[PDB]
Amino acid sequence: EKLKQDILNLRTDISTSSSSISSSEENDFWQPKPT
């Protein structure tokens, strides 16, 4: 994850998230993590 981010893009250095969608993800009603 080391690549020195935040230079001229201001947060989120090159993100695929733009116009992609599928099953509306699985996170949209409580995110229960392994306690």
The DSSP symbol for 18 reads S
- 3: Cβ contacts below 8 Å, ≥ 6 apart: 13
Give the pair of three-digit tokens for residue 9.
Answer: 């893009």
Q: Please state, in angstroms and rounded to a whole number, the distance separating the CA atoms of residues 28 and 35.
A: 19
Q: Are 13 and 6 in contact (CB under 8 A)?
A: yes
29: phi then psi, degrees, rounded to nearest 5? -175, 75
- Identify the experimental approach: NMR
